[PDB]
């Protein structure tokens, strides 16, 4: 039996994933936050990257663990807390190949110590996940590091906000097709 | 024999779960807290996520462990306790794929140190479980982070509270069909 | 089944990769920083090296982990922080051969402690990845160290900035061919 | 299947590598520093040794790891930093034979502490790699320890600087032959 | 498959190596250094021992590792540094037999602390390698401990310095026969 | 495949080694030093014991490792150093039988700390090797502890120092028969 | 293949060793020290016990290791050193049965610290070996604890000192019969 | 191959050893010390127990190791040393069954520290071995704990000291039959 | 082969031991000691429990180890020592089932520290063994905790002391039937 | 071979044990001790639970180990010692299923430190064993926690103390049937 970490890719799946990972992301994926200095910084939201990984590899095709999370510092100044957190996140595919990266979470200027630590820890883990996933290819966020793609992104017309249709939204816990397939699997 | 962690998904089960994990959750699953600042924050209750995981994967299909729980601080101010707890929670499927996330629990403003620590530790574990389960797809709470989804949710008519029918509620310990199936499995 | 770390190269794949790793990189891959002293320093951007590794070995052909990251020092002087971080990065191929190198990240002159630590840690990890990948051959950046190659680059005519065509950019999460191949694999 | 560390050499490969390792290096490989004392010290640049190892053994034929790196000292004097770093580097062939050596990196007279530490750590790792590779034979740098070889090198006429032709340079990521071979190997 | 450490010697290889290891070394291998007290001390240079080990066992026939290296002391006196370093070196053959010895490196009278430490550490490792290799037989330097052999060496006529012919020297990285054999191996 | 530590002796090899280990050593092996008190002490030089082990077991027949080396003390008195070093040496045969002994190295009265430590460490390792080898039989030095054997040695006529013939000394690295057998082994 | 520790005794070898171990030792094996108090204490010299073990079990039939050696104390009084050392020695047979015992080494009244430590450590190891070997039977020294045996030894007439004939002493390293058996073993 | 610890007893050997272990020891095995209080204390000498274990199980049939030895205290009073040592001794049979006991060694009233420690350590190991061997049955010294057995011994007539005949004593190292059997077993 | 801890019980042996363990012990096994308070306390002597375990399971049928022994306290008061020792004792059967219990040893009012520690340690080990054996059933001492059983025991007449017949006592080491069975086993 | 921890239950044994574990215990098993506050507290003696476990699973059917024992505190007040001890006890069945519980032992008001520690440690281990065994079902003491069962127990008529017949008591060490079966099994 082939469990996770021991399942070799077939030729077809390898070829499809290898071609799909080279795609660059459209403007629908790129958000912009204002960092220090008044310059526009582009990023991809964490849940978008999660959806991209779940489509590229499947829900059972990728895994990630936290190898280590370290609070670098918690400092108090004028009643406000400054917190730095680093996290090392390892992403593994079902064939066993893996990438590890460091993510950093920052909380500055909050009165609550617990809120600052919560924000910085969660941000470090998510940042580590995104940076580790970038190593697989452009479609998982590597392209966002290229200055030419960022320039080409700005010349595109600004698209309207997406509308989510909640007609086919899950409304009950039961998944009958899932239940039938699982029962037949036994 | 295929124990937990070594059971590869069949094609049909993989396809059904992959399609199911992709759909978003209705307003029946979304609750709203009031965080600091007067803004409405949407969330999914822990027991709802537990039911969603138990339906999506089966009761024997998923597992979770507490890799580590750390008290960040317990502070006393004006007789009130402020407690911060972080938990690292690892969720594993029966095929061996896993996700780990950090959860945080906070207790601020209680007189009892024991009650504060209890609340913060339990909240950290539950929050870690929810964040780890979000990594599998939209149907397990990954949609709660999309701004467009929340905007579309706020425009839906406010559905009335659900009514639970307790006529078909379990009233005695014995489960006859379970016993028959288990006895048949014993050889 | 051949999982990652146990997959021996075939003759054809070995020969093609051995020839490809041997060639040098064009000016399209070389950027230039300005280190202290006013002299021009050539380097390759991290995302470019990631793309080169993903094309040379495939997305499942190489892996990298962080063996250890150590903050050498965090110092405060005149309200500015000076941070030194070292990282040991191990790159492994799917056949099991590996290289490990040390990368260093430096942050000097920032007011924020958290920003300095974040920059230095991420720089150390990326620098370690680049130095570890250089050990496989010229095409992964080993050529950036040859002075004759740098002279030949400087004698080449300067090329116009690349234009990125975002027509065939990914705009939806779903990857139909990937899903088809994965479903058939099960 | 034969993974790295368990792949025994064939007779032909053993004979070819055993004869090739015995060669001494031409003047095209030797550079010279000016160490303290006004004497000329010959060495081989790190990237040249990397190319030599990748040709002698193949890209998948050799590996190296950092067993340990230790900062011996960081000292401050007159605003200048003096840094000593040692590194232990283990080189392994695909058949499992290995050599380990100690490399040393030195940074003296820099104002920046971070720059000094960076330089010393990188030099210690590179020095360890070169010294560990010397143990396989002359063609990987052992010959540079022989005084007679250095005299013979000094008596050779000086050669012109090499010219690198960048016409046949890699200009795009894709490697079609590599992709074809990999796809054929997959299934 | 027989990897390193579990490859038994054949009868012929055993007999040839057993006879070769019993030979004593000619004057071409012996160097002399002046030690304290005004007496001549004979030794074998490290690279000569490396060549002897590579010919006796092959390049893939022997291995050595550093089990432990310890700085005994670093002392400062009159601005000069005195450094003592010990190293434990284990040499293993491809059949699994091994010898371990301690090597010592000494640096006395240098102004530089880094130079003293570098010299002493490298000397300790090389000395340990030579002492561990002596345990296999006379041809690897065990003969240099016998005083009768040293008397015979002294009574031998002095030979002229060797001349190295660099006509046949490697001038380019590529090894064609090596590449052919490796490609056929896959 | 029978690697080191898993190679059972055949009946013939066992019988020959068991008979050879039982015999005592001639005066050609016994040196004499002068210890404190003016009494003559008999010993076997380390390189002789190494040659004896290599002939008795073969070059691949025995192994030794340093289990632990401990500096008992380094003391300074009147500018002179006194160093005590203990070493635990384990000798193993190719069939897996082993003996471990403690060896001691002493350096008293030297002005150099580094030289004293070097001498004591090397002597502890060599002493441990000799004491561990004595446990196999008389021919490896166990006889030198018997008073009757020493009395018999003292009554033998003193022989002239041995002469070493350097005609058949190794003068080049190459070992053609070794190379031939090794190439055929592959 | 049956390596050391995995080699079951045959019936014949078991019976012969079981009968031989039951013998008591003659006066040729018993020496006498003069312990404090003027009473005569009987003991067997270490090399005799080593020879007895090598004949009872063969050279490859028994093994001993030092599980732990601990210096209990090193004390200085009136310029003289008093050293106590304990060693735990484990003796194993080739079938895997083992005995462990503690041996003690004592050095009292020496000016040299190094000499005292050397003597005490070596005596502790030898004493542990003898006590561990006693556990196999009378012929390995268990008889020397019986008062009746000591009385019978005392009543025995004194025997002349043994004479050692050095006619058939080993004179050269080479063992021709060993070499050919080893060569045929490969 | 059945090595030590993996060698199950046959039925015949089990029955013989089970019957033999049940026997009580005669007066020839019992010695008496004078403990504090002026009362007679019976004991079996260590070498007698060694011989009994070697006969009951064979030389290759039992093993013992020292799991741990701890010096409880070394005290100095009036120039005399008082030493307490405990040892944990584990005895194993060739089938794998084991017993562990604690032995205690005491040295009181000696001027020498080294002699006191030596005596206490050796006594602790021997006492632990005897107590661990008692757990297998009466014939290995368990019977010496029964008051009725000691009462019966005291009523037995005193026996003359044993005479050891040294006519059959080993006089030289070589064991020809042992060498023959070992050589035949070698292949 | 079935090692200890891997030997499954047959049906007949299981049934016989299961019925035998259920018996209560007669007055011949019960001793009485006076504890504090002047009340009679019933107990079974350690050697009796050892005999019961050796008959119930065989000499090779049960095993016990000391998992941990801890001195709780050694206190001095009025020149008298008070020692508390706890021991954790694990009893295992040849099929692998096990019970662990804590035993306590107490020494109060002795002037000797060594005697107090000896008594307390030995009592802790013995008490742990008895408590661990009780959990297998009544015949191994579980009955001695039942008040009704003690009431029934008190009503039995005080039987006369047992008389030991030393006619068939072991008088020499040899066990010829054991020897022949063992020899045939090889 | 099926050692302890690897022996799967058959269908018949599973069904019988599952039915037996569901029974509640009669008043013959329930003792009452007076705790602080004057209320009556019901419990089961440790030896009774040991007998119940040995009948339900067999002597070779269950095992228990002490995972950890920790002295929480030893305090001295007015010459009296107050000792708190916790023990973690793990019970395993021969199929490998296990339960672990914490047991607590308390000794308050004794003058001897040794007696207090002995009492508290032994009580902690016994209490842990009882609580761990309760997890298998009512017949092993899980019923002692139900208020309705205790009310029903209180209404039952008080039964006379049991009488133990010592006619068929064990009087000699030998077990002839056990020896016969063991000898037959030996080969």
Residue numbers in the entry:
A (entry chain H), C (entry chain G), E (entry chain E), F (entry chain D), G (entry chain C), I (entry chain A): 23 to 208
B (entry chain I), D (entry chain F), H (entry chain B), J (entry chain K): 23 to 209
Could you pull the original sentences from the published paper?
Human RAD52 (RAD52) is a DNA-binding protein involved in many DNA repair mechanisms and genomic stability maintenance. Full-length RAD52 (FL-RAD52) is a protein of 418 amino acids, but it is not stable in its monomeric form. FL-RAD52 physiological form is promoted by the association of the N-terminal portions (212 amino acids each) of multiple FL-RAD52 molecules arranged in a ring-shaped structure on which DNA wraps around. The C-terminal domains of the associated monomeric units, whose structural organization has been elusive to date, contain two binding sites for DNA repair protein RAD51 homolog 1 (RAD51) and replication protein A (RPA).
Here, we report the 2.2 Å resolution cryo-EM reconstruction of the full-length RAD52 (FL-RAD52) protein. Despite our extensive data analysis, no minor 2D or 3D classes corresponding to alternative ring organizations were detected. The c11 symmetry was therefore applied, allowing to obtain an electron density map of the FL-RAD52 at 2.2 Å average resolution (0.143 FSC correlation criterion) higher than without imposing any symmetry (2.4 Å and 2.7 Å). As observed in other structures of RAD52 N-terminal, our model comprises a mushroom-like closed ring composed of a stem region formed by the β-β-β-α fold of each monomer (residues 79–156), and by a domed cap region at both the N- and C-terminal of the stem region, that ends with a flat top. Most amino acid side chains between serine (Ser) 25 and cysteine (Cys) 208 were well resolved and clearly recognizable. Interestingly, densities at the N- (residues 1–22) and C-terminus (residues 209–430) were largely absent. Densities corresponding to 498 water molecules, equivalent to about 45 water molecules per protomer, were identified in our cryo-EM map. These water molecules are connected to the protein ring by hydrogen bonds and coordinate to FL-RAD52 single or multiple polar residues and to the polypeptide backbone, also forming connected chains. In summary, this analysis allowed the identification of a water molecules network that stabilizes not only each protomer unit, but also the protomer-protomer interactions, i.e., the overall N-terminal ring structure. In addition, in our 3D structure, several water molecules were also observed at the inner DNA binding site of FL-RAD52. In this region, several key residues, known to electrostatically interact with the phosphate backbone of the ssDNA, namely lysine (Lys) 152, arginine (Arg) 153 and (Arg) 156 are involved in water-mediated hydrogen bonds. The position of Arg55 in our model is clearly not compatible with the binding of the ssDNA to the inner DNA binding site, suggesting that this residue may also work as an entry/exit gate for ssDNA in the first phases of FL-RAD52-ssDNA interaction, not only during homology search.
